[model samples]
Every structure is written in C-alpha cells, then in structure tokens.
Target: KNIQVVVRCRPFNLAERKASAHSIVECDPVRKEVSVRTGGLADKSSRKTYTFDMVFGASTKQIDVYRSVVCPILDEVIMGYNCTIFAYGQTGTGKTFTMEGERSPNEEYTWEEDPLAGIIPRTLHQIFEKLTDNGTEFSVKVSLLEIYNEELFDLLNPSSDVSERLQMFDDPRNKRGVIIKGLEEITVHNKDEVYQILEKGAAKRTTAATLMNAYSSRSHSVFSVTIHMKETTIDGEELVKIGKLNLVDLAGSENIGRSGAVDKRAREAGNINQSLLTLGRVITALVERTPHVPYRESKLTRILQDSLGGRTRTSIIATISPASLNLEETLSTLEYAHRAKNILNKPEVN
Candidate 1:
C-alpha cells in the first residue's frame, strides 16, 4: 500500500486518427499486463510483454481510473503521512490529461458534478469534503513549484526571479530528506479556494508546442498540499499533525528526432531528458537495492527524495499511447512502469 505503479493507455488524439495510426498494443487490465507487438512480423524481436500493479485501458474514464488508483491514499494521508502521486510517460501520452484533466474552452465547473476534472481537482475536492465531514479542526496550505533547466522556479511567485524565490536546501547533508526554501505557500479554507490557486499556477507553468503535442509541458510541475490537523494530546497539550500530498505532473519524455526539435527546443529537450535520465538512474538504483541512491544528482531527484524512497506513500500512473506509430515508446514506458512496480518505499506517520 505504500507505493504502487499503475499504467494507463490514452485514446488516440485527432492528429493520430488523421495520420491513420493503428493500435499495436494489447492490455489485460485484470492481469495487469501490457503486451506490445513491435516491428514487422518478420522481425523476431518484435514481441514484448510487461506486468504492473494496475493497468487501465484507453477507454477507461478519468474518474474510474482515479478511483482504482488514487482513492485509498486519501485515508493514509489524512492520518498524518506524506503521499505522492506522479504521472510519467513519453510525449503526448496524457500525463497532463491524467493529472490536470481537460476543461472546456468556454466552460466552468463548481466542480460538484464535473467529471472531467482529473486527480488534482477530484482528490482536493474529496479531501476537503472529508475533512469537513469529520468535523476536524484542520488548516491547509498549498505550494506550486517547477523545475526547469535544472533550476527551481516558484510558480506562485511571478514577481521574483527563480534564484530569489526557490532554493534547494538539503538537511545537514540531506539525511533528513531534501527540502526547498522560499516557495510561496497559500492558506486555503475550502476546495474552491484551492482551485483558484491551481488555475493561476497552471497558467504560469512552462508549456510549448512540439511536433508530437500542441501544449506539451516543458518542465516538471510539483503541487504540494500541507495539511495541519489540530489535535489535543492525552495530557491536553495542543498538537499540530502535518501531512503532505505531493502531486507531480512530469514533463513528457520525447526524442529530439521525433519532436523535430531545434535551437531553443533542442536545448529544452537536452535539459528535460537529462533530468529524466537521472530519474531513471535513481529508479534503477532503488530497484537494485543499492546502498546509496543518487537522490542528489539533480534538482528533480533531490526535491523528490522523500517521495521516492523515504517516508512517503508513493504512486505512479505510467501513461502511454497505444498507436502503432509509437510502438517503441509504448514498450519503453511499459518496461519502466513494470520495474517501478517492484520498488518499495516505507511510509510512517509525521
């Protein structure tokens, strides 16, 4: 229950259909298997299969998929433990869609009956509601941060420079887990308030057009929610229990050749891929049970030190496109998730 990796295949977009992309991937949701037939039939190395903790098909609804993967973590988080949910995959594989969801061009939601809102909105709404329903005395604060070109940026602070607003501060040598300094935090009393802050932060996030996607995220976005539960100890001492929910929407992984990147785009690709490469290395080390994990190798890894291996309840939704045109990417994503499924992160109360 500490950490589970789930893979989801998103439906083909309009461009894919216009280009006549066919599905070359098969999935067995019940068995948590992803079977891909790569290359031509003549190529004997074309077939590969992988297993994950959970699998969701292209036709799965956002709400339904969220329920299966992210619902139960709410209880553990409310009990004063840190929890993390991250979406990882190649370009145009629905990382943003799964994390932020798609809202209409000219529409809005009180969020009460809107089904399109993804994990962020859905989970926040539910958390606030549950806290109110339990009649607990709680205070919540939210912070939005971004890691771009190996530099940390505060999405909430538009007026300050990256260096002034965000800084990485690892404890006495990082033994107490990595922490960021000078991040803008806002107090929230209700779900609506949180959404407003998120809307602003999302607008400030770094996104750009690539050959594979129209508004692909060019940087990793981390939205952290800190909940302080006011409680009375047995001896009547006032106590504040802190619980954190770190939701990460990672930049889509892309190959420069496929993305047709050049100049600034090429530089972006270089930086983006390097961080993810470091992330891949970190994951491999953890999977192999290495004595020392390379959490300090990059800003992204350092920021996620706690979420990746320390006291955190972590979950990942590895998204992929089933299109035959992207067979290589699909298989690579499946393999990554399959290995991540084996990682173990022990969680404890804060």
Candidate 2:
C-alpha cells in the first residue's frame, strides 16, 4: 500500500510575530491541501497547491493530531504488524516538538496528563491503556537511538558513556531488516515507566548536543517499540504475536551549501546533508520503480529500508513553518513529502 503522508503548518512563533512576518503557507485541513505562495506578493495565481493524506493547520491540537494519524497506525501495531511513523521537515519546523514534546511547566498535570505531550509519550501511554485487562500476556520493549555523523548512539543505554557507537548488521533471517549490536532495549512494564525512559534519553541527547553544536538538529533519532503478546486459544493452543513500531524524528531536511570548508562544523553539516540527500534519492528510486534502490548509500536509508518501500505500514508527518521567511524551505519540504506518498509498502503480521 502507498505510504501515508501528512503536512502540518505550525503557528508563527513569538519572534516571527514580533518581526511581522507574513504567512506564505495556507493549510486547509478540511480539503486536505496546502497552498503555498510561489511568486510575487501580488501574484495570487502563482499559488501552488498540494494534497496529502491529511493536513493539520496551525491551530491543530496535539491530541487531535494523535487521534487523526497515530490512532489507526497504533491499532495495526497491536495486531502483529510492524509500523513506522516519522516526522520530516526543515529545521525548527516542530519535528522534534511533534515527535517528543516537552512537559508543561504547570505542575497541575503530569507528563502523561500533559496536553502538550507529543506522539511518543501519548502513544506509549495509550498502548498500556488499550492492552490493560485484555487477558493477553504481553510485554513492551523500547529502544532509543540517535544517528550523528552517521554513527548510531543508544540513548537508552544506562552506561555512563552514551557516546559509544552501535554497529548494524543485516539480519540473515529477515533480508529487509538489520540488527544493531549493543543497543539497549528496555522492557516497559507500565505506561508511567515511559516518562522516565524518555527523560533519560532526552538528557542523553542534550549531553551530546552540548558537545556538538546543534547536534540534535543534525542527528536522526529512532525510538522503537516491540510488543510481544501471547494468547491462548479456546482449544488450549497458545500463539504469539510480535508487533513493532518505529518512531523516527529525522534530521532537518534543510539544504546546506557545500563549500568544502575544512572546519569541524562544516564536516558535521556535510554528513547531515548526505544522509537526508540519500533519503531523497531512495524515495525517488522507489517511486520510479528503479531496480537499484541504493539503500546502502546512507545509514538512515539503510536502517529504514523496510519502512520506505518494503513491508512495514508507514506514515510520515511533514511539518512546516507558515512564515514567509521560510517559504523556500517550506515549499521544498511539501514537495518532498508529496513525492513520498507514491512509495509503496506491503505490511504483514509478524
């Protein structure tokens, strides 16, 4: 089936509002289309329109977004299907906010009860709620990893060094999947346990960011959940179902000039560009039905090979800014996401 793609337009921030920035992107969630200003200020006819699986306007609520896109996908994940939902867009476009949101400053509500909680938190909380008292013997395991400069770092590993790199090898049994060595997979017994896990991962990500400038924006974070469930049939037969979910917050999809500068910062930006560039190529190859898909070109593409065009039920939340200052990148992001809708996947129960 075709991959689901949705676009979300974030409201103008304080700085933008103070600067009197004009809105160049218009989202009509009712019609599921995004129209962007493509030409001069007075050129109304120059507006380009793109339709997606869903569209969330600036005023869209966090819970509403979850209900619209994630609910169905999570349902599939519980039914022994491997599913993926990744956020993609330019820098500062709310990709991280939409994937792993912050805790509300108000102490009145917990992270689980926070209205601002994002997909990762909300999904985990909901998983336990759904499976509770269902009479199935089940377990949920989670692993968080961030890829920086093409190296994988396990954020959930309790070791003192979160900097240790994890290596990936092809899974002989599953040709489309790869196994990562030394990645910690923590078993989650309760929904509330997820907050502590996420908090630790966030701190690890921040620690790396402090060492490397804007490391989080330049790195891709993949949070995976595996559900192992056992059910007993009426005839006294026992069966097992394993479902997987990968929540990926991709590196910023911005294009950076390659001046071949010898600085450390320049090299870091180049690597970030390389992976996102490879991702675009992979999408194009799959859409065009090319025989050689070039998944090995980058670590990001290689790791998500199965989700892009193989056998995982996948969805992409493409976030964007409505400000005129980011018009170029906004249009680029929308076009890229629009193309992703064509890539197909054959989802199956594990």
Candidate 3:
C-alpha cells in the first residue's frame, strides 16, 4: 500500500517575528492577498498589499493548527501505512522556524531537549505516545539521509565515506516497494530514543551561513522511522508489521542573484535550484498521472520517489517570509506548494 499526502501551509507566529524582528508573511486564507510591511520606510507606518496567493502579517504561533489538522492525518499514516512530513520554501522563509523554533540568543536548544519542537521530533513523539497509550505492539527503527551537492550522505553513518554508493533493499515486508541500504537503521523503544537518533543525525547534517538565511541547511535531509509492529489478536493469536514514517526537510530552493550567493555558494545554489526544478517536474508528471514520472533525474527525487507522488501519507508545509524583498521567493514557493496540493496520492490498506 502507498502513503497518504497532506498539505499544510505554516505561517509565522508573533513570538517568532519579535524574536527575529521579522514580520509575518503568508497567503491570507480568506482574502488571498499577500501583504508586506513598509513601516520602516520614511513617512510610512503601514503595510502594502499585493494580490497573490500569499499573505503577510504578524506571526500567530498557533501550533495547534499543525497538531490538529496535520497530526491526526499523521497518526493515521503511522498506524495504518507509510507517511512523510516535509517543509519546503525559500531560505529565511521560516522553514526551520516552523519545523524547529528559534532558541534564545544565549540559551541554545539542542536537538535532544525537545525533538517534538521540530516537525520530525514532534511527529515521532506523537507516534510513540499514541502507541503507548493505546498499547499498540510496535517497535520503531530509524534511518537518516541527506543529499548535498548532488551526492548522497547518510546522516547516521557520518564517519563512513560520503561517496559510498547506496543500493535498494527488497523486503516483501516493505509495501513501499524500495528501501535504501548502507543507511544506518536505529532501533527505538520510545520517543526519547527517537530524539537521541535525531540528535546524532543532526550533528552530521550539512549547514552553513548564506546571505539569504543564517544557519542555512546546505542539504536535503530525510529521516525515516520504520514501525515494526507485532499486533496480537485479542485471543493472542497473531501479529503483524505495520508501516513507516518518512520525514523530510528539503533544502531551500534559491536563485543565486536573488540570494546574493557567489563562488561556491553560487554553484551550490545552482545545484539546489536544478534539483528543485527536477522535483517540480516530477510533481507535475505525478499530478497529470503521466505514464512516466522522471524520478531518477536527480538523487533527491529518486530517494523520495515514493513520498512525492507515491502511496505514502505525505504532508507539506510551504514556509515564506513576510518581507517585500522576498516577493519573488514567496511567489515561487506558493506555486510549488500549489502544484503539490494538486498531485494525487493513492493510499493503500494493508
């Protein structure tokens, strides 16, 4: 069976804006207007509005929206079939801020403290919490991967050669069709164990400062949690293996000129843009139900072939900044999210 896909547009919250001194930007769900603040301009203490599929305002910090609308769907995915939650948008558009919160200037928030604070962490926490509460007989195993400079690197196997080739594993148990090998899979007993796995993986993630975003992620990271369940019948007769969770945080797509990137940064930006373009094309093919979707065109899409348009329960959050300077990026982000919303995912029952 394939996974289900859900789309969530995560906007900014008030505290996030005040902490970063950045205004909220989003697509007004009601008016469909993209608003921008211009208070810093001389003789102007107001905002300007643009008619776009975008919106800009104060950050709302409504975490429950994600908990409510997105989490239930994820719950269904983890228990019934494969699932994935990912963030996409331009750099400095609050993708990280949405998935993970901004730490105090002096007090840093390490990955271990509260994995649930981020998208992957939070989802993992819920999966185990629900499992424990419902007495579901399941054990989760995890694997982490990142695509940087068109190369595949295992976040879990950081000390291993970065250039090591990855192969697909054929497991009849895996209804998702394929799985990556040479990738380290960690056994986890509870949510805390999952956090430990994430912390270890974060240490290997590729991040560098760029003009567009501070602490910018330089690679597309995918963290997979495979839940192996042994469900005994009420009479204690039999058991079964359920599904997996594929949580992804894609590298922000960028334009060199717009992002003020140069030299190595420029080259990296080009590669990121190209890979994202391929992703867009793949999504288009899936939405049109084309007989051939170009998943192998890039390593990013190839690895995510199942999640993008596959039978996985997928949810996407398109992050964006509220500043006028990011108008182009905002537009591009919305277009991509819109396309994803149209792509169909055929969920299958085990």
Identify the candidate with maximal TM-score.
2
Which candidate has the highest lDDT of all? Answer: 2
TM per candidate: 0.92, 0.93, 0.79
For model 2, how does the per-residue alpha-carbon lDDT over 1-350 read when each residue is reduced to its tens digit?
Answer: 89999998888877678878788888998899999987756674578899999999999888888999998998898899999999998767788889887778857677768878899998998888877756789999999998888999888888775367789999988887999998989999987788789878866663123121233465888999999999999999998999999999887754444123245645556787788889888999999999999899888988899999999999999999898777778888898899999998999999
Clashes of each: 0, 0, 20
Worst 10 residues of 3 by lDDT: 1-10
> Which digits, one per residue and each the tens of the lDDT, describe model 1 over residues 66-161?
788777877778889899999999989989889888774456655534667788888888889778876668998888888888888888775654
Candidate 3: global Cα-lDDT?
0.66
Clashes of 2: 0
Q: Point out the higher-scoring one by lDDT: 1 or 2.
A: 2
Off by over 4 Å in 2: 42-44, 206-216, 255-265
User: Model 1 — TM-score against the truth?
Assistant: 0.92
The true-versus-predicted C-alpha distance at residue 201 of model 1, in Å, is 0.6
Q: Model 3: per-residue lDDT, tens digit, 1-350?
A: 22222223344534345556454344464574554454553524465444432333344343543564457666666566777667788876656655644333444654424322566666676777777776767777888878877877777764655447566554578655666777788888877777777777876687777866667888888878777777677797875756777677788888767668878877777878888889889988877888999988888887777777767666676666655456566667766666677776766544
How accurate locally, in lDDT, is each candidate? 0.82, 0.84, 0.66
Residue-level lDDT for 129 in candidate 1:
79
Off by over 4 Å in 1: 39-46, 105-109, 158-165, 171-174, 233-239
